[PDB]
Amino acid sequence: GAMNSSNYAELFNNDIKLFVDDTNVYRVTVHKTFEGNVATKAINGCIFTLNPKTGHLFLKIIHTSVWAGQKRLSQLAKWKTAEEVSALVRSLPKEEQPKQIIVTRKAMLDPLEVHMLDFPNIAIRPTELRLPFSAAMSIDKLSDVVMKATEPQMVLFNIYDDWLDRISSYTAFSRLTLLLRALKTNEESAKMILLSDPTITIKSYHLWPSFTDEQWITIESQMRDLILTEYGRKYNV
Amino acid sequence: MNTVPFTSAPIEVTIGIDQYSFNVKENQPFHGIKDIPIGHVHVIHFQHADNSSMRYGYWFDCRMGNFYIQYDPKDGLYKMMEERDGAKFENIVHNFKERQMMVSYPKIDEDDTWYNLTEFVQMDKIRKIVRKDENQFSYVDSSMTTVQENELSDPAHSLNYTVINFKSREAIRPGHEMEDFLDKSYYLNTVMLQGIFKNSSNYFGELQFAFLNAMFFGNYGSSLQWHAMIELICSSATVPKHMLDKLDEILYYQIKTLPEQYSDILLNERVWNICLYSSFQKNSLHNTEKIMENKYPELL
Numbered sequence A: 001g002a003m004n005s006s007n008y009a010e011l012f013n014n015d016i017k018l019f020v021d022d023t024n025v026y027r028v029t030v031h032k033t034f035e036g037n038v039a040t041k042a043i044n045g046c047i048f049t050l051n052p053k054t055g056h057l058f059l060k061i062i063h064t065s066v067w068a069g070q071k072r073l074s075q076l077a078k079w080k081t082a083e084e085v086s087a088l089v090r091s092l093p094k095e096e097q098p099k100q101i102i103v104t105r106k107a108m109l110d111p112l113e114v115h116m117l118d119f120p121n122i123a124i125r126p127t128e129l130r131l132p133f134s135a136a137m138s139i140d141k142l143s144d145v146v147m148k149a150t151e152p153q154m155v156l157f158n159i160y161d162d163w164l165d166r167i168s169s170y171t172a173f174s175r176l177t178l179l180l181r182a183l184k185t186n187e188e189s190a191k192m193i194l195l196s197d198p199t200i201t202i203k204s205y206h207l208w209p210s211f212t213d214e215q216w217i218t219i220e221s222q223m224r225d226l227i228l229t230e231y232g233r234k235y236n237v
Numbered sequence B: 001m002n003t004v005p006f007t008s009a010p011i012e013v014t015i016g017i018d019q020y021s022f023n024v025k026e027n028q029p030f031h032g033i034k035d036i037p038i039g040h041v042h043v044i045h046f047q048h049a050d051n052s053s054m055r056y057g058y059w060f061d062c063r064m065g066n067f068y069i070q071y072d073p074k075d076g077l078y079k080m081m082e083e084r085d086g087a088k089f090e091n092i093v094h095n096f097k098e099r100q101m102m103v104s105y106p107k108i109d110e111d112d113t114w115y116n117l118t119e120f121v122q123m124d125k126i127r128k129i130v131r132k133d134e135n136q137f138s139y140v141d142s143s144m145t146t147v148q149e150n151e152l153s154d155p156a157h158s159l160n161y162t163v164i165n166f167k168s169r170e171a172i173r174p175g176h177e178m179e180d181f182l183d184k185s186y187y188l189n190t191v192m193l194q195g196i197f198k199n200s201s202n203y204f205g206e207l208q209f210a211f212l213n214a215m216f217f218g219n220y221g222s223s224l225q226w227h228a229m230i231e232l233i234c235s236s237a238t239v240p241k242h243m244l245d246k247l248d249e250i251l252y253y254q255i256k257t258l259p260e261q262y263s264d265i266l267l268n269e270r271v272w273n274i275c276l277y278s279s280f281q282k283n284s285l286h287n288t289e290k291i292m293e294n295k296y297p298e299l300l
């Protein structure tokens, strides 16, 4: 059934599962033509497929060439996402194939369910959670690799860097969703907070700064304060 | 014209024959139905005055033998039987007519309703859905489940309707994942029409049989089957033009005949709104669309 606040901790058990988020698959700019009509231009996108237990990310880069000559692109985007997730499962050894795939948007259920027809023991699940994975293109190294791509490409990352050397999956996912929540609500402030101190750097093989345990606590407090504030601004509370 | 005699009517029951039905009181002298039009299938069905659950009945065709009804007080229901002694059968029928204890199948000459409801229904196909090859007639009731239902328990009592599943191995070609799920013309024409049903008349026949089973017995898995076969056509972009025009007639008389107080459970909002208004075939069901709006604008 649907994933929600109650069955949240199921993410960190030892059943392999992946989150799939399709929000950044079909990305446009919207501009005016000479005649004054509005037109779109697609830019490169990505499927954000993530194992919440291990941090392994399978960033499938969607090159704008895939839309060329195609109609109803937003619908096609959902089928392409499923087509690529399918192929990713089929590329993995049997013992690494997920037992569940959780889609962040319910419109993905039917496309994934048809691409996975022959994979009847993999359960495709929706969710009631409001996960911030759209903000993934606010992570500089991810936005960079997507925008530079010249062809379809799969790039693998660990979205938790080395955190699991020291904290649990549960804690690591909570840090990740907090950081992405903040970047989503106010990217400029979120990014200021992360980089302010020029002496905390990001390893070449990492996505986030090499904070000590204490500095993560400060950071996480700052990201929480950011989020609450923006909410008062949104609703006047 | 043919006859179905009844030995007796020992328990109060409402008897139906096709779209007609009569109330019969406990131990009222009732001894059958006469003047039944030869040339179509027919259904004789029952609902006891005491147990308004379990509607049940028998599909039959008078050309396939001499059939009669007889109450069984052990099993507690009216059973259909075959008389093989043709002489002994003309005799009972004559003596019962002579005594005028039989109702006349009450057809208006202007009325083609039953023909329209049963145009493509064949007794031979019914006996493949309701498998019981020792009888020439077929028993159906409110509670029987379908093969597809059983897959998600006693197969002897199963409605072997043709299994339709839009998210199946059968429904989608490898590589046409998106095309076939949006445009079922492949499930419909190649896998079902040319593959399983062989032609549109057998397809239409099972569709019509499913509807009648839902209407007469409130058989829930028949309703499911009827809607599935409607949806498969309406969700195909490429349909023979002869099928579309006949479908509009088929659906029109089915909607026309439905009791008004049953549309709630018998009509699936989603399928109809998709068929009438969202599907490839929204424009091909002019009569079915006109009668649905003037009779059940609520569900829409």
Ligand SMILES: CNCc1ccc(O)cc1
Pocket: A086, A114, A115, A116, A117, A118, B168, B169, B172, B173, B174, B175, B177
């Ligand atoms: C490979 N995509 C799932 C699938 C769909 C249909 C089919 O006949 C086999 C497999």
